[PDB]
Amino acid sequence: DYYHATKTTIFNALLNTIDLSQLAQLDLKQAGEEIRDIVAELVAIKNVSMSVAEQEHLVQDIINDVLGYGPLEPLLARDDIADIMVNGAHRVFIEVGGKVQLTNVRFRDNLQLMNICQRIVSQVGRRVDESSPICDARLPDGSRVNVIAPPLALDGPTLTIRKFKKDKLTMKNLVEFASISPEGARVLGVIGACRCNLVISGGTGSGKTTLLNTMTAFIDPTERVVTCEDAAELQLQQPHVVRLETRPPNLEGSGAVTMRDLVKNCLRMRPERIIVGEVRGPEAFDLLQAMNTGHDGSMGTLHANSPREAISRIESMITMGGYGLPSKTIKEMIVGSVDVIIQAARLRDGSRRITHITEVVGLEGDVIVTQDLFVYEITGEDEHGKVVGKHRSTGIARPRFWDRARYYGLERELAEALDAAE
């Protein structure tokens, strides 16, 4: 009560005293010090009786409101709070330990919330308002931010901050979730590290993108990666990642930038690895060429249930490309370009597994030949219906990519991992 009234009076006095532009001229620390001095002077003038703790709290709150993110700052500073979700000025939720909880934190009004959202997004040069109500951003520290303006959000501006939790998308999660056995995990690490061209095929709900992030986690830091996605969800930890996002056509059907355009441009940016979020149309062709003409180590997810169907769908995509390529030419391209196909699927019980790790070996007999390094053998189901299976290595001790592993010095690791698969 008294603290709130004192804060309101001090804020009014400071606003009447210092303009927003003048404070913006000063840096975060210089502006903060100047605001602290002005607030002390205003408190002395108003003869407000406040203790050291109360005075410090009021000064910090005034500084945060005038400069910074206001009532959000205490939440952001906390480490336990993984995600913050503000639905209008009068409600805030925090995700602690995987559970969402309501918090007493409340903004002054929707106007202050909009100002704070605009500052947060502008921290990376983006702006959100009625003209562009939807804004999405990734702050340099890894926090994702999503903001919806009042014209779309009926109850007020909506803000969603998801801080960078690091453990979610590493091989440990897959190994402990029985998605891939530890030997399979080591084989995948070798495949990713040795710049093997990959095509992650997966069925509906098979978590293809999660597997793609986990695989790209192996990329060497120095490699200049370029990611094309319809909607940015990959979170490469590397220092030299370029992120691109397609653009759908406007309501007039113009101004579009399809994934094919992004891949063709990627060819002209000197990338050492092209990652395609999801191949759906002609872009496959371009992507495949990117694999063939250097850039070895690219990747791309695809919608298919088995590796053979994945190859067939790649052929159909390239054919959709419109070029008069004979089927034999397309098969030769695929055989020469793609090196490993990872088939991940969602089984009956809803669990996710890496059903196959297979290698495109050649074009014997005008039909592409694939040898499976790892397969998932379904033995049975638990008493409660849960499916039961195990990862078996086919025993191919010399995968066609063995030469790359030897070149990169990972041949010993590959042999050790694939030998003890059992």
Place this chain on the structure above:
Amino acid sequence: DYYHATKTTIFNALLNTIDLSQLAQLDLKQAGEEIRDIVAELVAIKNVSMSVAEQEHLVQDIINDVLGYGPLEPLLARDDIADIMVNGAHRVFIEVGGKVQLTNVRFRDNLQLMNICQRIVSQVGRRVDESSPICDARLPDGSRVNVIAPPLALDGPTLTIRKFKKDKLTMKNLVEFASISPEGARVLGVIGACRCNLVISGGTGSGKTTLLNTMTAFIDPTERVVTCEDAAELQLQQPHVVRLETRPPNLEGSGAVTMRDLVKNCLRMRPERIIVGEVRGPEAFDLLQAMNTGHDGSMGTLHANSPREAISRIESMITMGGYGLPSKTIKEMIVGSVDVIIQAARLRDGSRRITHITEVVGLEGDVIVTQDLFVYEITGEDEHGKVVGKHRSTGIARPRFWDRARYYGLERELAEALDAAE
């Protein structure tokens, strides 16, 4: 710290002192002199305690930021920097000695970087912005530039400067680098000498232009060769070469002289070989007419990955040229005009070699039938990661262009080359 703060203060004072538009209206010399004078006056007023060298550096930086290319200027001035990549306002990498290194150079912000990129791409009459987020160009100094706008490049505008390198070869160089077997070299010499219509297709990084330059050494010196280019990259050593260069449209959208107009004029320049630096527009149609109306021996570089893909690309180009030509008519024209397609591509290991030497032998029904003379067969990889392969002749003894060889007496050499690599 002190230097950065002084530079920021000087920039703010200069911005508040002179309008950007007025300086832009000023000429290079006048603008530079005014900027230097204003910077010196501001430094004197603010009493910046720095050496004369420090003042000169500050003035140069202010001039570059106001009208130059910002922090890229020291990078561009350098020589060891093979190329520069900007992944955003706060990420700049340079390829020094073939190694990518993160430079301690940062732009003021994303807006400044976007303005710098817009200036650079406007230097050759092109605009990059939300409406045209992707812009690839070639600067006068020979360097290639690629720019992606924020709407696609999520992390901010992305820039890529790849500086020019000579990279010119002679057929002996290609033979010694195994780019083409000696029999292939003889066959290519025969094809070039006998004024056989050529289309040197190749993928990105294949150096197709270098291959075209190498091919234009078997031309009879007497033949009047007219080379139409976009940046003057060909260095023909023949004595009667007329070098033409297209003029990109000015920022106002006028004064454009497209390659199509250059070729159409060349039709009336009495040439014997219309050489096109790169076919990427409707000009192909006209070029084909030149190929099929007495200017035998015309060559044209094209961007395609396989001879069939090159043919399809040419057909699509002619169709997009805006004419009412039925697809069957365009295919018939292509079959009649073109006589040899040389496919130069970069292999996965980064090396570049000639893959196909294919004649457009005829048209059946709707599909164009073509026969390969020389084909590159790959045989895996070696210990050092280099691709292992060899060229083999298809065994044809009477190639379609045989008559042309008979014209110049090159029948014997053609037969010997086709026999020695059976």
